[PDB]
Design a protein around this motif. Structure first.
Motif, PDB file in Angstrom:
ATOM      1  N   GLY A  41       5.722  -1.350   4.642  1.00 45.70           N
ATOM      2  CA  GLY A  41       5.482  -1.953   5.932  1.00 45.70           C
ATOM      3  C   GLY A  41       5.805  -0.904   6.973  1.00 45.70           C
ATOM      4  O   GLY A  41       5.888   0.283   6.643  1.00 45.70           O
ATOM      5  N   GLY A  42       5.973  -1.297   8.224  1.00 40.76           N
ATOM      6  CA  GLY A  42       6.347  -0.245   9.174  1.00 40.76           C
ATOM      7  C   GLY A  42       5.177   0.632   9.553  1.00 40.76           C
ATOM      8  O   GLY A  42       4.096   0.499   8.954  1.00 40.76           O
ATOM      9  N   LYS A  43       5.348   1.532  10.521  1.00 36.09           N
ATOM     10  CA  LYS A  43       4.259   2.404  11.022  1.00 36.09           C
ATOM     11  C   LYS A  43       4.086   3.583  10.093  1.00 36.09           C
ATOM     12  O   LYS A  43       2.940   3.960   9.861  1.00 36.09           O
ATOM     13  CB  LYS A  43       4.650   2.931  12.400  1.00 36.09           C
ATOM     14  CG  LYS A  43       3.730   3.951  13.044  1.00 36.09           C
ATOM     15  CD  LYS A  43       4.411   4.613  14.212  1.00 36.09           C
ATOM     16  CE  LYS A  43       3.452   5.319  15.140  1.00 36.09           C
ATOM     17  NZ  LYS A  43       2.603   4.352  15.870  1.00 36.09           N
ATOM     18  N   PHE A  44       5.169   4.094   9.522  1.00 35.87           N
ATOM     19  CA  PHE A  44       5.081   5.313   8.697  1.00 35.87           C
ATOM     20  C   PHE A  44       5.299   5.039   7.209  1.00 35.87           C
ATOM     21  O   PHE A  44       5.780   3.962   6.871  1.00 35.87           O
ATOM     22  CB  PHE A  44       6.086   6.339   9.225  1.00 35.87           C
ATOM     23  CG  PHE A  44       5.714   6.910  10.565  1.00 35.87           C
ATOM     24  CD1 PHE A  44       4.496   7.534  10.749  1.00 35.87           C
ATOM     25  CD2 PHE A  44       6.574   6.812  11.643  1.00 35.87           C
ATOM     26  CE1 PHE A  44       4.145   8.057  11.979  1.00 35.87           C
ATOM     27  CE2 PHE A  44       6.219   7.337  12.874  1.00 35.87           C
ATOM     28  CZ  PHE A  44       5.010   7.961  13.038  1.00 35.87           C
ATOM     29  N   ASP A  70      15.877   5.379   7.959  1.00 37.37           N
ATOM     30  CA  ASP A  70      15.200   5.563   9.271  1.00 37.37           C
ATOM     31  C   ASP A  70      13.773   5.038   9.192  1.00 37.37           C
ATOM     32  O   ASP A  70      13.298   4.829   8.079  1.00 37.37           O
ATOM     33  CB  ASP A  70      15.179   7.031   9.680  1.00 37.37           C
ATOM     34  CG  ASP A  70      15.253   7.258  11.181  1.00 37.37           C
ATOM     35  OD1 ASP A  70      15.008   6.299  11.938  1.00 37.37           O
ATOM     36  OD2 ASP A  70      15.555   8.400  11.582  1.00 37.37           O
ATOM     37  N   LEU A  71      13.102   4.882  10.328  1.00 43.21           N
ATOM     38  CA  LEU A  71      11.754   4.275  10.325  1.00 43.21           C
ATOM     39  C   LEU A  71      10.745   5.276  10.880  1.00 43.21           C
ATOM     40  O   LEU A  71       9.548   5.042  10.696  1.00 43.21           O
ATOM     41  CB  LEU A  71      11.814   2.995  11.163  1.00 43.21           C
ATOM     42  CG  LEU A  71      10.986   1.808  10.687  1.00 43.21           C
ATOM     43  CD1 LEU A  71      11.665   1.124   9.514  1.00 43.21           C
ATOM     44  CD2 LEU A  71      10.794   0.818  11.823  1.00 43.21           C
ATOM     45  N   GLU A  72      11.211   6.358  11.492  1.00 43.66           N
ATOM     46  CA  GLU A  72      10.298   7.352  12.105  1.00 43.66           C
ATOM     47  C   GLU A  72      10.818   8.769  11.901  1.00 43.66           C
ATOM     48  O   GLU A  72       9.976   9.676  11.802  1.00 43.66           O
ATOM     49  CB  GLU A  72      10.150   7.095  13.598  1.00 43.66           C
ATOM     50  CG  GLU A  72       9.192   8.050  14.280  1.00 43.66           C
ATOM     51  CD  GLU A  72       8.516   7.515  15.527  1.00 43.66           C
ATOM     52  OE1 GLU A  72       8.296   6.291  15.598  1.00 43.66           O
ATOM     53  OE2 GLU A  72       8.220   8.325  16.425  1.00 43.66           O
ATOM     54  N   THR A  74      12.938  11.417  13.779  1.00 46.02           N
ATOM     55  CA  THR A  74      12.580  12.398  14.843  1.00 46.02           C
ATOM     56  C   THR A  74      13.814  13.057  15.454  1.00 46.02           C
ATOM     57  O   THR A  74      14.922  12.606  15.135  1.00 46.02           O
ATOM     58  CB  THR A  74      11.873  11.749  16.035  1.00 46.02           C
ATOM     59  OG1 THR A  74      12.824  10.948  16.736  1.00 46.02           O
ATOM     60  CG2 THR A  74      10.680  10.910  15.644  1.00 46.02           C
ATOM     61  N   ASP A  83       9.842  14.861  21.414  1.00 39.98           N
ATOM     62  CA  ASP A  83      10.544  14.874  20.113  1.00 39.98           C
ATOM     63  C   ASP A  83       9.664  15.520  19.056  1.00 39.98           C
ATOM     64  O   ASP A  83       8.446  15.603  19.254  1.00 39.98           O
ATOM     65  CB  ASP A  83      10.985  13.470  19.715  1.00 39.98           C
ATOM     66  CG  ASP A  83      12.353  13.093  20.252  1.00 39.98           C
ATOM     67  OD1 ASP A  83      12.784  13.708  21.243  1.00 39.98           O
ATOM     68  OD2 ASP A  83      12.980  12.189  19.668  1.00 39.98           O
ATOM     69  N   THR A  85       8.411  14.757  15.785  1.00 41.39           N
ATOM     70  CA  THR A  85       8.237  13.706  14.763  1.00 41.39           C
ATOM     71  C   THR A  85       7.716  14.318  13.464  1.00 41.39           C
ATOM     72  O   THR A  85       6.886  15.216  13.535  1.00 41.39           O
ATOM     73  CB  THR A  85       7.253  12.668  15.289  1.00 41.39           C
ATOM     74  OG1 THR A  85       7.598  12.361  16.639  1.00 41.39           O
ATOM     75  CG2 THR A  85       7.237  11.394  14.474  1.00 41.39           C
ATOM     76  N   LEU A  87       6.304  12.327  11.303  1.00 45.64           N
ATOM     77  CA  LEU A  87       5.202  11.413  10.934  1.00 45.64           C
ATOM     78  C   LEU A  87       5.480  10.870   9.540  1.00 45.64           C
ATOM     79  O   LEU A  87       4.543  10.793   8.743  1.00 45.64           O
ATOM     80  CB  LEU A  87       3.893  12.195  11.034  1.00 45.64           C
ATOM     81  CG  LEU A  87       3.422  12.552  12.440  1.00 45.64           C
ATOM     82  CD1 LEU A  87       1.947  12.916  12.411  1.00 45.64           C
ATOM     83  CD2 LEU A  87       3.652  11.403  13.404  1.00 45.64           C
TER      84      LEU A  87
ATOM     85  N   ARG B  31      -0.884  -4.157  12.365  1.00 44.73           N
ATOM     86  CA  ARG B  31       0.292  -3.402  12.814  1.00 44.73           C
ATOM     87  C   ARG B  31      -0.054  -2.468  13.968  1.00 44.73           C
ATOM     88  O   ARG B  31       0.497  -1.375  14.099  1.00 44.73           O
ATOM     89  CB  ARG B  31       0.945  -2.634  11.659  1.00 44.73           C
ATOM     90  CG  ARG B  31       1.270  -3.504  10.459  1.00 44.73           C
ATOM     91  CD  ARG B  31       2.551  -3.068   9.782  1.00 44.73           C
ATOM     92  NE  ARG B  31       2.314  -2.055   8.762  1.00 44.73           N
ATOM     93  CZ  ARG B  31       2.281  -2.302   7.460  1.00 44.73           C
ATOM     94  NH1 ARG B  31       2.452  -3.523   6.983  1.00 44.73           N
ATOM     95  NH2 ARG B  31       2.072  -1.297   6.614  1.00 44.73           N
ATOM     96  N   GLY B  39      11.580   8.679  22.643  1.00 47.00           N
ATOM     97  CA  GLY B  39      11.639  10.144  22.767  1.00 47.00           C
ATOM     98  C   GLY B  39      10.311  10.838  22.528  1.00 47.00           C
ATOM     99  O   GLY B  39      10.251  12.047  22.737  1.00 47.00           O
TER     100      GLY B  39
END
Ligand SMILES: [Zn+2]
Ligand SMILES: [Zn+2]
Lengths: 97, 217, 96, 107, 126, 215
Positions: A41-44, A70-72, A74, A83, A85, A87, B31, B39
């Protein structure tokens, strides 16, 4: 009709609270050599090494359990205005199911 | 009198009923609302961001719905009026999907290293009488060094309208129809490809229907 | 409207990190604690990056160490051999 | 091109005219015999084997002129036209796709 | 011709002004579609700038009331072995069970938070 | 074919090479205009002057602007603009005033169609900042209809030639605001000491209002 505020409040990534140390199920969706590219799930996506124990029970589609740190993932460095990232998110693979 | 197959869709609002292909729930499950961190934000994406949850920004899906309506209406109208729709991205995880989407429709896809002067030194680079695209749709506005794509500036320099999915770290400045939305998740990118493919295909089949009706009339 | 967010100060806010000596009284007669923040071989006062003390505590330990060594409580060039046995709290690693 | 077409016509007619002046007026004058006939007809004596005279089908003589990549609508033929490297990127896309569906199944 | 000055205005404004003057004889294919259905903001160039003094972003932090108790739950009873799914909508985690039961008693009618907590703790124990 | 190209600056520009030494390159600035609003400038650089001229004009036609004109003769208002270190001060003027501007501004405004305007340039007179600041201000004019739409009020004219007669020049295309404009007594506006000097008659110059030729 549900408003976006309602969609958000009653959603499982908004009931998870702080991602650190929250156990999450994910699905392998790509494998390179031994790097398993999983979701949760999540963006990444997270990338995890192949666990050598039971090291053939980790294929494309396998449901695994992850710790989540962590979820991202950065950080800002010396001269940066934004930042850096990667990805990708950060999780530790505990096992299967 | 063909100014009825080229003026009629332009007075019917939502002439292609493109309003029934996406809902704020369809986007939420794709999503689309999930963004980057505070940031990695942009001052010009600040008007489109609902707020920040746990230092992870989220995009306002009602604004995404309105912007996506306008974007898909524009894309449908250009595909009906037989423009050239070029889908540009630099993802590397979705290149296969964008080129296959162009080939399943009949439009075009640039997913590789944009050579300098593709739209600008175009006559020298391709040939004296080339038709440059009449609509460029960016599925990912940033390049791989997390900077805005050369095409967004050169499309504007060359006066080609641009539709683009702008995430939190992007510049919605020189993009004609920005669609505030997540472009880092396979479900989101898949839904964008599905929506644009459906719009373009429906637009071309409707153009054929009106040409057939007027030809029989 | 009922599910729109609300202005509040951050829950899940972790309480600020505290120093090993936060709330304790550093004294110049406490050559057992002062010796902990010194180097076993040279007697060199350790820095913040080794001790992990707040600014207030790095200052009090430095001043108490200097007071005790000029007063006749602490060795200057070594850690009293009697204290090369107490709980190590310093992030340094001489042996390999 | 009309250039290529008339060059072809001219080779064919000139090849038959070549077998007449020699003696192989029967229709099948091969390319080796063509090289043989021009060698003698006009003696070379030049060190570069390209600087000597020649009588090939225009095909090999003239290079490969690429076809037009767009009709009279604009609307370029290949979908990867605006890369400028249609053939190469189509091949790379195809090879990536066969690697992908093979991973889904499994000088 | 055309105007490759991407910074002065929008493609619409440049094209409209040039077809008004009479240098762009044919209008482009997209001009009438723009004039029928314009965007919510004309694409004019704006130079990004760093906020310097007492200028702060308008973006707010999303905090709901349940998070006061959510934060408390994790504090006392940590994240259990019942793992989050996240891939399925309508997932009701154990902490969601806790907040729903707690908010239940709250609606019913209770007062001090600690009494609320012990009652819903025994409720989830049942 | 309705476009006229006029040069504005030709400079012999040099760089140093390891083998050759001083290498000349002609740098030229030209401006193209049809006297109907469409005009623009560009730089061409070459080793030959004809090549530089060709490059400059064929690039400016692709980099044109569009300047809005009041009654196709003057600018809408007064424009004060500092581009880098060049200060251009232009005043809208009535008909028959002529082009009393710097010679480059006269050529540029003949290519644009502006016939009557006053202009004084100060600071550094660099041609490649003069043209750029001129085009910046003239392309960032605010017209009467835009002012009427922005304020919601009628934009009306009062000429001393006609009299007390009101001449409506721009009405809003939407609703009309009914709260009147706030009469801010003693306005806080930044005035120019040269303008106030000319108003009070303490501007003594033997160069100012000189009898010159047409435009
Ligand atoms: Zn992104
Ligand atoms: Zn402390």
């Amino acid at each position: 009709v549900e408003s976006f505020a309602s969609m958000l409040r009653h959603s499982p990534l908004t009931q998870m609270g702080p991602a650190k140390d929250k156990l999450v199920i994910g699905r392998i969706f790509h494998i390179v050599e031994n790097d398993l590219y999983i979701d949760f799930g999540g963006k990444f996506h997270c990338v995890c090494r192949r666990p050598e124990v039971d090291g053939e029970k980790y294929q494309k589609g396998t449901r695994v359990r992850l710790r989540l740190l962590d979820l991202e993932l950065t950080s800002r460095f010396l001269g940066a205005t934004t930042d850096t990232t990667v990805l990708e998110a950060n999780a530790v693979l505990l096992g299967i199911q | 009198f063909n100014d009825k197959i080229l003026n009629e869709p332009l007075k019917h609002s939502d002439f292609f009923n493109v309003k029934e292909l996406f809902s704020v729930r369809s986007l939420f499950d794709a999503r689309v609302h999930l963004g980057h961190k505070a940031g990695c934000r942009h001052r010009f994406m600040e008007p489109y961001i609902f707020g920040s949850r746990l230092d992870h920004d989220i995009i306002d899906l009602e604004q995404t719905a309105t912007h996506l309506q306008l974007a898909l209406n524009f894309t449908a109208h250009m595909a009906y009026r037989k423009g050239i729709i070029l889908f540009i991205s630099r993802n590397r995880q979705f290149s296969y999907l964008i080129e296959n989407m162009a080939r399943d429709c009949g439009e075009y896809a640039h997913t590789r290293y944009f050579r300098g002067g593709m739209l600008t030194n175009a006559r020298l680079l391709f040939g004296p009488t080339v038709r440059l695209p009449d609509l460029i749709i960016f599925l990912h506005t940033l390049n791989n060094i997390f900077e805005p794509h050369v095409a967004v500036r050169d499309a504007a320099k060359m006066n080609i309208p641009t539709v683009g999915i702008v995430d939190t770290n992007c510049n919605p400045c020189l993009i004609t129809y920005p669609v505030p939305g997540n472009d880092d998740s396979p479900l989101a990118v898949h839904l964008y490809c599905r929506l644009f493919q459906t719009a373009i295909t429906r637009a071309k089949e409707k153009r054929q229907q009106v040409e057939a009706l007027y030809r029989l009339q | 409207n009922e599910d729109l967010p609300i202005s509040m100060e951050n829950p899940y806010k972790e309480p600020l990190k505290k120093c090993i000596l936060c709330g304790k009284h550093v004294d110049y007669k406490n050559v057992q604690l002062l010796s902990q923040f010194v180097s076993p071989f040279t007697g060199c006062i350790y820095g913040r990056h080794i001790t992990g003390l707040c600014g207030k505590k790095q200052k009090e330990i430095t001043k108490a160490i200097k007071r005790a060594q000029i007063m006749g409580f602490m060795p200057v060039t070594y850690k009293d051999p009697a204290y090369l046995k107490d709980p190590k709290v310093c992030n340094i690693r001489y042996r390999e | 091109e009309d250039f290529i077409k008339k060059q072809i016509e001219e080779f064919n007619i000139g090849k038959r005219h070549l077998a007449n002046m020699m003696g192989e007026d029967p229709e099948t004058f091969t390319q080796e015999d063509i090289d043989r006939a021009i060698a003698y007809l006009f003696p070379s004596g030049l060190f570069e084997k390209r600087a000597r005279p020649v009588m090939k089908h225009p095909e090999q003589i003239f290079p490969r002129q690429r076809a037009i990549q767009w009709g009279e609508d604009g609307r370029p033929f290949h979908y990867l036209f605006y890369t400028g490297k249609q053939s190469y990127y189509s091949l790379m896309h195809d090879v990536y796709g066969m690697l992908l569906n093979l991973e889904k199944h499994q000088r | 011709a055309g105007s490759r000055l991407e910074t002065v205005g929008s493609i619409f404004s440049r094209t409209r002004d040039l077809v008004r003057a009479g240098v762009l004889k044919e209008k482009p294919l997209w001009f009438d579609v723009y004039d029928a259905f314009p965007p919510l903001r004309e694409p004019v160039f704006q130079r990004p700038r760093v906020r310097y003094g007492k200028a702060k972003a308008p973006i707010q932090d999303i905090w709901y009331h349940e998070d006061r108790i959510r934060a408390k739950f994790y504090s006392v009873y940590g994240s259990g072995q019942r793992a989050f799914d996240l891939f399925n909508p309508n997932f009701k985690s154990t902490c969601q069970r806790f907040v729903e039961k707690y908010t239940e008693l709250q609606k019913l009618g209770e007062t001090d938070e600690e009494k609320l907590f012990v009652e819903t703790g025994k409720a989830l124990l049942a | 074919e309705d476009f006229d190209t006029r040069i504005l600056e030709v400079r012999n520009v040099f760089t140093m090479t390891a083998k050759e030494g001083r290498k000349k390159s002609i740098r030229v600035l030209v401006a193209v205009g049809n006297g109907k609003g469409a005009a623009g400038f560009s730089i061409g650089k070459a080793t030959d002057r004809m090549d530089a001229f060709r490059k400059a004009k064929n690039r400016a036609v692709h980099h044109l602007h569009y300047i809005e004109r009041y009654e196709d003769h003057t600018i809408f208002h007064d424009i004060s603009l500092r581009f880098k270190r060049t200060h251009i001060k232009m005043k809208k003027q009535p008909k028959g005033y002529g082009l009393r501007c710097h010679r480059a501004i006269i050529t540029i405004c003949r290519l644009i169609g502006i016939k009557d305007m006053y202009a004084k340039v100060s600071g550094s007179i660099n041609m490649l900042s003069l043209t750029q600041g001129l085009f910046r201000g003239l392309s960032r004019q605010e017209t009467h209809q835009q002012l009427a739409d922005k304020k919601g009020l009628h934009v009306v004219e009062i000429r001393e030639e006609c009299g007390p007669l009101p001449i409506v020049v721009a009405s809003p295309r939407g609703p009309l605001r009914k709260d009147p404009e706030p009469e801010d007594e003693v306005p806080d506006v930044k005035l120019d000491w040269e303008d106030v000097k000319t108003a009070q008659g303490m501007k003594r110059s033997v160069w100012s209002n000189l009898k010159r030729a047409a435009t």
